[PDB]
Design an enzyme around this catalytic site. Structure first.
Site, PDB file in Angstrom:
ATOM      1  N   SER A 141       0.862  -1.211   0.000  1.00 50.99           N
ATOM      2  CA  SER A 141       0.000   0.000   0.000  1.00 50.99           C
ATOM      3  C   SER A 141       0.887   1.247   0.000  1.00 50.99           C
ATOM      4  O   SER A 141       1.728   1.396  -0.904  1.00 50.99           O
ATOM      5  CB  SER A 141      -1.025  -0.108   1.126  1.00 50.99           C
ATOM      6  OG  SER A 141      -2.133   0.746   0.891  1.00 50.99           O
ATOM      7  N   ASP A 176     -10.037  -4.350  -5.068  1.00 42.24           N
ATOM      8  CA  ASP A 176      -9.389  -3.434  -4.141  1.00 42.24           C
ATOM      9  C   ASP A 176     -10.011  -2.049  -4.292  1.00 42.24           C
ATOM     10  O   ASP A 176      -9.878  -1.413  -5.345  1.00 42.24           O
ATOM     11  CB  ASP A 176      -7.893  -3.408  -4.462  1.00 42.24           C
ATOM     12  CG  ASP A 176      -7.066  -2.668  -3.420  1.00 42.24           C
ATOM     13  OD1 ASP A 176      -7.565  -1.701  -2.783  1.00 42.24           O
ATOM     14  OD2 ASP A 176      -5.888  -3.047  -3.261  1.00 42.24           O
ATOM     15  N   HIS A 183      -8.101  -5.396  -0.326  1.00 41.92           N
ATOM     16  CA  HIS A 183      -6.836  -4.661  -0.334  1.00 41.92           C
ATOM     17  C   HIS A 183      -5.699  -5.391   0.385  1.00 41.92           C
ATOM     18  O   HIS A 183      -4.575  -5.450  -0.121  1.00 41.92           O
ATOM     19  CB  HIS A 183      -7.051  -3.293   0.303  1.00 41.92           C
ATOM     20  CG  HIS A 183      -5.819  -2.448   0.335  1.00 41.92           C
ATOM     21  ND1 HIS A 183      -5.068  -2.195  -0.794  1.00 41.92           N
ATOM     22  CD2 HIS A 183      -5.206  -1.794   1.352  1.00 41.92           C
ATOM     23  CE1 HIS A 183      -4.045  -1.419  -0.475  1.00 41.92           C
ATOM     24  NE2 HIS A 183      -4.113  -1.154   0.820  1.00 41.92           N
TER      25      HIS A 183
END
Ligand SMILES: O=C1CO[C@H]2CCN(C(=O)N3CCC(C(c4ccccc4)c4ccccc4)CC3)C[C@H]2N1
EC number: 3.1.1.23
Length: 295
Positions: free
Chosen positions: A122, A239, A269
């Site tokens: 991320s 996601d 995610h």
């Protein structure tokens, strides 16, 4: 006679002298973690966590990598976890990259000659990309778990409007709403763990930090034609935070001769904390990819 001041402590009141740590270029203490094998390491790998979370959430991944005879190391980014700094604030996104490079440089002094890998998720994946792009040829490989390349398009428009508002006036406290924890993972236990961890910051995103995350997106886009590092890219098709279009863009625009994408159909995610079928595959594929590049 002058006396030494009371020991510097984490935001949770633990003395840094009792913990592995590093002091960054701004004089801020970063909390560090290490997982080293019993034998001589085959390689080093830095683990780069995402926004609002911390390095303790990588315990299982790190222990898998240590079992491959890599020396795994991490720190909590400034403003996160057990490191210093106002929560989820950064003067410029590059602070995160600079601090990763300081830790990498320090570890390579103690373990010279070893290849060094990056693993990022991320926001931490954006940090990993920018770290590798700053030092072409220096890293042996990069593992990216749903890296921040393109944010969800609808959400991105929101942060861009708020940014323009704060960039025009003085509104230090303005924030967006908190991240909806239900979009993190189809694994409800992991959503519940996220909501229970006192080291996770679940407040709304301050607009100033959202601006720095927008800076990361812009800088990542400019970095792709400079990126030559081998990478494995893992991305869920559902996601809602890091849009899968960013993963396809990274595959297309990076210059790396060794690039692989695996899409997890229907996954959300946080792929390393997803349904067991997905998480087991994520661990296995990272295992295979790193094993093939450290043998
Ligand atoms: O395990 C975890 C726990 O926290 C999870 C959420 C935060 N995240 C993490 O880096 N994040 C990176 C930042 C994005 C953020 C965003 C994107 C879509 C909708 C809402 C918010 C954003 C904001 C401005 C510009 C660009 C992107 C969210 C994802 C780590 C992740 N992984």
């Amino acid at each position: 006679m002058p006396e030494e001041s009371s020991p510097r402590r984490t935001p949770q009141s633990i003395p840094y002298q009792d913990l592995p740590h590093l002091v960054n270029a701004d004089g801020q203490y970063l909390f560090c973690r290490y997982w080293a094998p019993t034998g001589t390491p085959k390689a080093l790998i830095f683990v780069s966590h995402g926004a609002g979370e911390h390095s303790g959430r990588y315990e299982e991944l790190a222990r898998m990598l240590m079992g491959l005879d890599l020396l795994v190391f991490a720190h909590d980014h400034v403003g996160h976890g057990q490191s210093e700094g106002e929560r989820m604030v950064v003067s410029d996104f590059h602070v995160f990259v600079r601090d990763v490079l300081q830790h990498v440089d320090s570890m390579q002094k103690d373990y010279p000659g070893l290849p060094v890998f990056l693993l990022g998720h991320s926001m931490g994946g954006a940090i990993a990309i920018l770290t590798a792009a700053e030092r072409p040829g220096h890293f042996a490989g990069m593992v990216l778990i749903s890296p921040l390349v393109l944010a969800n398009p609808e959400s991105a428009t929101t942060f861009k409007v708020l940014a323009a508002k704060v960039l025009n006036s003085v509104l230090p406290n303005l924030s967006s709403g908190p991240i909806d924890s239900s979009v993190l993972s189809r694994n409800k236990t992991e959503v519940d763990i996220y909501n229970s961890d006192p080291l996770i910051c679940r407040a709304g995103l301050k607009v100033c930090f959202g601006i720095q995350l927008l800076n990361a997106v812009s800088r990542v886009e400019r970095a792709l034609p400079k990126l030559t590092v081998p990478f494995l890219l893992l991305q869920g098709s559902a996601d809602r935070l890091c849009d899968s279009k960013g993963a396809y863009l990274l595959m297309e625009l990076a210059k790396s001769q060794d690039k692989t994408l695996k899409i997890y159909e229907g996954a959300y995610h946080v792929l390393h904390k997803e349904l067991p079928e997905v998480t087991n595959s994520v661990f296995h594929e990272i295992n295979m990819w790193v094993s093939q590049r450290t043998a």
